[PDB]
Write an enzyme that holds these catalytic residues in place. Structure first.
Site, PDB file in Angstrom:
ATOM      1  N   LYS A  31       0.795  -1.244   0.000  1.00 53.52           N
ATOM      2  CA  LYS A  31       0.000   0.000   0.000  1.00 53.52           C
ATOM      3  C   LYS A  31       0.829   1.298   0.000  1.00 53.52           C
ATOM      4  O   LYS A  31       0.405   2.301   0.551  1.00 53.52           O
ATOM      5  CB  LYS A  31      -1.008   0.007   1.174  1.00 53.52           C
ATOM      6  CG  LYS A  31      -1.869  -1.236   1.270  1.00 53.52           C
ATOM      7  CD  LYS A  31      -2.668  -1.242   2.561  1.00 53.52           C
ATOM      8  CE  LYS A  31      -1.841  -1.703   3.746  1.00 53.52           C
ATOM      9  NZ  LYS A  31      -2.696  -2.160   4.860  1.00 53.52           N
ATOM     10  N   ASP A  91      -4.959  -6.742  10.381  1.00 54.43           N
ATOM     11  CA  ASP A  91      -6.278  -6.088  10.512  1.00 54.43           C
ATOM     12  C   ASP A  91      -7.443  -7.019  10.172  1.00 54.43           C
ATOM     13  O   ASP A  91      -8.521  -6.852  10.725  1.00 54.43           O
ATOM     14  CB  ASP A  91      -6.351  -4.783   9.719  1.00 54.43           C
ATOM     15  CG  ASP A  91      -5.950  -4.821   8.249  1.00 54.43           C
ATOM     16  OD1 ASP A  91      -5.257  -5.769   7.848  1.00 54.43           O
ATOM     17  OD2 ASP A  91      -6.215  -3.831   7.537  1.00 54.43           O
TER      18      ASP A  91
HETATM   19  O1  LIG Z   1      -5.261  -3.451   5.046  1.00 54.91           O
HETATM   20  C1  LIG Z   1      -5.678  -4.509   4.186  1.00 54.91           C
HETATM   21  C2  LIG Z   1      -4.527  -5.371   3.712  1.00 54.91           C
HETATM   22  O2  LIG Z   1      -3.693  -4.554   2.858  1.00 54.91           O
HETATM   23  C3  LIG Z   1      -2.553  -5.207   2.275  1.00 54.91           C
HETATM   24  O3  LIG Z   1      -2.982  -6.212   1.405  1.00 54.91           O
HETATM   25  C4  LIG Z   1      -1.679  -5.852   3.361  1.00 54.91           C
HETATM   26  O4  LIG Z   1      -0.649  -6.628   2.757  1.00 54.91           O
HETATM   27  C5  LIG Z   1      -2.510  -6.736   4.290  1.00 54.91           C
HETATM   28  O5  LIG Z   1      -1.703  -7.181   5.374  1.00 54.91           O
HETATM   29  C6  LIG Z   1      -3.702  -5.969   4.851  1.00 54.91           C
HETATM   30  O6  LIG Z   1      -4.497  -6.845   5.636  1.00 54.91           O
END
Ligand SMILES: OC[C@H]1O[C@H](O)[C@H](O)[C@@H](O)[C@@H]1O
Ligand SMILES: CCOP(=O)(Cc1csc(NC(=O)c2cc(Oc3ccc(S(C)(=O)=O)cc3)cc(O[C@@H](C)COC)c2)n1)OCC
Ligand code: NA
Length: 441
Positions: free
Chosen positions: A152, A188
């Site tokens: 991200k 998360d």
């Molecule tokens: O925040 C949503 C997701 O974003 C990205 O894919 C991260 O790699 C993952 O760990 C997280 O859960």
């Protein structure tokens, strides 16, 4: 059909396209779980060390951290005929603290914790802390985990290959302003699932549709080959955002997807997430509109310098365009600010373009969740399941959840799925894992 709608049609996915995506997700999930193929698997299926348990947790105050984006959250969770009360504070991480070192990033976080403690009259208290860290991690235990890679757009140096809990502890000690026991580190997805489980014990799936896109689920320990044991279940962080990283989605990728990837901070990585996530949605729309302009089908073939700037079309604008009542006022106001003089037809084209991108995101996402749910039905041999969901795309986008719910139900024939929109999930759930973990520590 208009030439515009001929271009927009490229976003369409047939029911069979979605079944093919779903089957491949299941194959890739199986690959991540097996010791023989885990290293080559695009979908990592990372063990969380969060095990199945019917027991109540420890009573008391639990601190929570939620790092997964530019807006960081500190929560106080009071666990007490169970009652769970929360207090929070939000913090925006400056660009300098997200592009510098891991030490700089963890010093910023610690500074925020200190502020939270001051504002809540508890700087002198040593509390247990649950840490939601929304990035791919290889856990050794519930409280030890190596950062595999950033996602991200995060890019702080000296974090990858290092124990994230250690970086948090180091920053707290350098500050010497307060004390804390970091008892748990969760994704998360995991925190959302745990938070929703508190409301509904049928919740054994956690899903995020926000900046990024991911899912966790309760897997049978015998299928979790990376953790010795066959008794009970363990939560598995799929990291399905990386699906497509070994060509799985190549047949579905559009020119907009290649461009979004090529200019991203992680080229060739998180390809499935790039089709869904709010970090990329607005950019996908921008790229589509520019193709329409270049083909002399939108804005009289003339685009503003703003529209030609990466990131100018914000993911919130996509949501705003789709919330338009029909008078085109909301659409006009977004485009006027973007330096355009659009016609009534231009405004309608923009809406159709937003709907094409967001409908594909909802459908692609449903294929992934269907893969997880149908896989669970087979492992547990009419399946009644609850899925805990968080993220701005799912919560705030008009008809994203409606399209996603409809599509997921079509793909899961003998399943009765209940969706729980998690309010504070991503943060509250880390504190609840901390409260359960604390029984032993
Ligand atoms: O925040 C949503 C997701 O974003 C990205 O894919 C991260 O790699 C993952 O760990 C997280 O859960
Ligand atoms: C340190 C101990 O080591 P460990 O091996 C490794 C570990 C360390 S924490 C953990 N599991 C968990 O935290 C955990 C927490 C869950 O959510 C809650 C539990 C209780 C409450 S309440 C009402 O306040 O009582 C609220 C939320 C659910 C769960 O699983 C379901 C989603 C599925 O189960 C029904 C597992 N596993 O422990 C095993 C227990
Ligand atoms: Na196992």
């Amino acid at each position: 059909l208009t030439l515009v709608e001929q271009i927009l049609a490229e976003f369409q996915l047939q029911e069979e396209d979605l079944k093919k995506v779903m089957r491949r997700m299941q194959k890739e999930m199986d690959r991540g779980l097996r010791l023989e193929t885990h290293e080559e698997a695009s979908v990592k299926m990372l063990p969380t060390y969060v095990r199945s348990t019917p027991e109540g947790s420890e009573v008391g105050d639990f601190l929570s951290l939620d790092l997964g984006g530019t807006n960081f959250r500190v929560m106080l969770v009071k666990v007490g005929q169970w009652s769970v009360k929360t207090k929070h504070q939000m913090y925006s991480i400056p660009e300098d603290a997200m592009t510098g070192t891991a030490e700089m990033l963890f010093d910023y976080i610690s500074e925020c914790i200190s502020d939270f403690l001051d504002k809540h009259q508890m700087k002198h208290k040593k509390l247990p802390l649950g840490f939601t860290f929304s990035f791919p991690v290889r856990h050794e235990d519930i409280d030890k985990g190596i950062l595999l890679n950033w996602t991200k757009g995060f890019k702080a140096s000296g974090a990858e290959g290092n124990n994230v809990v250690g970086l948090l502890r180091d920053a707290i000690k350098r500050r010497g302003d307060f004390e804390m026991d970091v008892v748990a580190m969760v994704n998360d997805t995991v925190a959302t699932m745990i938070s929703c489980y508190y409301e509904d014990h049928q919740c054994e799936v956690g899903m995020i549709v926000g900046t990024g896109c991911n899912a966790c689920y309760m897997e049978e320990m015998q299928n979790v080959e990376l953790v010795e044991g066959d008794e009970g279940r363990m939560c598995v962080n799929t990291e399905w955002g990386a699906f497509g990283d070994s060509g799985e989605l190549d047949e579905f990728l559009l020119e907009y997807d290649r461009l979004v990837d090529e200019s991203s901070a992680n080229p060739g990585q998180q390809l499935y997430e790039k089709l869904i996530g709010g970090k990329y949605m607005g950019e996908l729309v921008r790229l589509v509109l520019l193709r329409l302009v270049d083909e002399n089908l939108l804005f009289h073939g003339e685009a503003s310098e703003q529209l030609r700037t990466r990131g100018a079309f914000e993911t919130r604008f996509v949501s705003q365009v789709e919330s338009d009542t029909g008078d085109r006022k909301q659409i006009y106001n977004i485009l006027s600010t973007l330096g355009l003089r659009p016609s009534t037809t231009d405004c309608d084209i923009v809406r159709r373009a937003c709907e094409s991108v967001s409908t594909r995101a909802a459908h692609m996402c449903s294929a992934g969740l269907a893969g997880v749910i149908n896989r669970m039905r087979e492992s547990r041999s009419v399946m009644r399941i609850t899925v805990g969901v968080d993220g701005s795309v799912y919560k705030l986008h008009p008809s994203f959840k409606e399209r996603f719910h409809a599509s997921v139900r079509r793909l899961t024939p003998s399943c009765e799925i209940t969706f729980i929109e998690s309010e504070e999930g991503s943060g509250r759930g880390a504190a609840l894992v901390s409260a359960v973990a604390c029984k032993k520590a």
